[PDB]
Amino acid sequence: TNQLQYLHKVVMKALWKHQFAWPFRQPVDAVKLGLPDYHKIIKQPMDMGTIKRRLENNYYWAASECMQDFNTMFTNCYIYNKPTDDIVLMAQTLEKIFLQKVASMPQ
């Protein structure tokens, strides 16, 4: 759709290159980061690399499905981390860009 193409070429494009994007470009690697409780707490892992591949492979049926994956990714960050963690501020920053850009998504 027009909408998915916008989420791909405008919204993801903008988030991907952001200085705070790097933790979100691939799945959380619980072994490398030493987080034995990550997959016990976060039951639906999501990252922008996954979303991006989904956009490329025509996985999504509707814009809202993709927006829901974006939302899951940010929500997982807030749920798992301490409120004072830098990553929380990084996610909030990225989430505000997402919504600002979503407001202009062609209908």
Ligand X SMILES: Cc1noc2c1-c1sc(C)c(C)c1C(c1ccc(Cl)cc1)=N[C@H]2CC(N)=O
Task: Detail the residues annotated as belonging to a binding site for a protein.
Answer: 37, 80-82, 85-86
CB of 32 to a second copy, least distance (A): 21
The entry of ligand X, a second copy, none that residue 92 binds, CB within 5 to 8 Å by partner kind = a second copy
CB of 80 to ligand X, least distance (A): 5
CA–CA distance, 24 with 17 (Å, rounded to integer): 11
Where do we find the tokens 């409780």? 37
Q: 37-42, long-range: CB within 8 Å, 24+ apart, which pairs?
A: 38/80, 41/79, 41/80, 42/76, 42/79, 42/80
The site for ligand X (CB under 6 A) is made up of 23-24, 28, 33, 35, 77, 80-81, 86-87
